[PDB]
Write a protein that binds this DNA or RNA. Structure first.
Ligand code: CA
Ligand code: CA
Length: 314
DNA sequence: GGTAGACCTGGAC
DNA sequence: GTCCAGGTCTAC
């Protein structure tokens, strides 16, 4: 059918594949795992969301990642469009090589890895990432998802409508920094997060030199980037690490939340050796990130994603 | 320098 | 009805 969300069966000629075995990527273990909060499984095994300013639907078979895009006459995705998809999933980073290494250095990762293959990091937009995670504060993945889409519906560009879903592009800096945005976000249920969204939008635009400041962080060192990000209102150590890891190409960045504390304790009998505190605190959190980084290497943030994800299923 | 308490809320046990 | 989720900010 010409309407509604597509499916591999439904509209055969509208899809194009990207070679990709399930061992290198698993949508159901990545898309709803707290990295991006903008993907939904409309029909079973089919995920629809905004990717590179367009709406896509993705579904995978054992060796292929099937993609379809909604923009002109309907048609399969072009090689360039598909390239953007390959880019978003950083398919050039070989998950098999990373899992192997992590496995040989961490007997525990080995055990968990066997059952949770295909977990990788998405290369996200700094702006979308920065604001989505500002909303992470004392919040669960479902509530976060709700806030973010409401935020996008209210200040994001209208893209296309499939069934009763009107997809929106992520709001721009200028839009989020607009008069009365906070008040609006509060009526949307973001709570005290409304304030930080507005504050950070204005901060970047009226104090840091704008969008470029954020984007230039991809060329900066992990340390510089993380240091810079913490300046923004509502952006602490954890949020900045998420941004570094998920959007600034800092693969060693390890977000330390309660989840990783439970993992560190239960699975590694970890204890803080520096800080004198027995639980989560700025100094012990820093210490843990260094513990994982020392344990897994340069792509510790990635290894972190595999366990965080596995810890969510449970 | 290293804590405790304030800040919002929808789904839980 | 108290509890919990990918926290952060700041006053003592
Ligand atoms: Ca929490
Ligand atoms: Ca800050």
């Amino acid at each position: 059918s010409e309407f509604g969300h597509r499916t591999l069966a439904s509209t055969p000629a509208l899809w194009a594949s990207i070679p990709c075995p399930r061992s290198e990527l698993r949508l159901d273990l990545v898309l709803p795992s707290g990295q991006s909060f903008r993907w939904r499984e409309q029909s079973p095994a089919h995920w629809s969301g905004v990717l590179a300013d367009q709406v896509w639907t993705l579904t995978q078979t054992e060796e292929q990642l099937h993609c379809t895009v909604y923009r002109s006459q309907a048609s399969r995705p072009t090689p360039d469009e598909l390239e953007a998809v390959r880019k978003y999933f950083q398919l050039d980073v070989t998950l098999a090589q990373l899992y192997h290494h992590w496995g040989s250095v961490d007997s525990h990762f080995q055990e968990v890895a066997q059952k949770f293959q295909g977990v990788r990091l998405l290369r996200q937009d700094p702006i979308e990432c920065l604001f989505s995670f500002i909303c992470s504060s004392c919040n669960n993945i479902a509530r976060i998802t709700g806030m973010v889409e409401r935020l996008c519906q209210a200040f994001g560009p209208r893209l296309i409508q499939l069934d009763d879903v009107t997809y929106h592009g992520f709001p721009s800096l200028q839009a989020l920094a607009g008069p009365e945005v906070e008040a609006h976000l509060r009526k949307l249920g973001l709570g005290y997060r409304a304030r930080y969204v507005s504050a950070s939008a204005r901060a970047i635009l009226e104090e840091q030199g704008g969008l470029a400041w954020l984007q230039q962080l991809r060329e900066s060192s992990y340390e510089e980037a993380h240091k810079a990000l913490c300046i923004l209102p509502g952006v602490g150590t954890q949020v900045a690490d998420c941004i570094c890891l998920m959007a600034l190409d800092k693969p060693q960045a390890v977000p330390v939340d309660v989840h990783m504390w439970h993992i560190a304790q239960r699975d590694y009998s970890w204890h803080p050796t520096t800080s004198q505190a027995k639980g989560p605190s700025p100094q012990t959190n820093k210490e843990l990130g260094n513990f994982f980084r020392s344990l897994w290497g340069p792509y510790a943030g990635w290894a972190q994603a595999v366990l965080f994800s596995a810890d969510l299923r449970q």
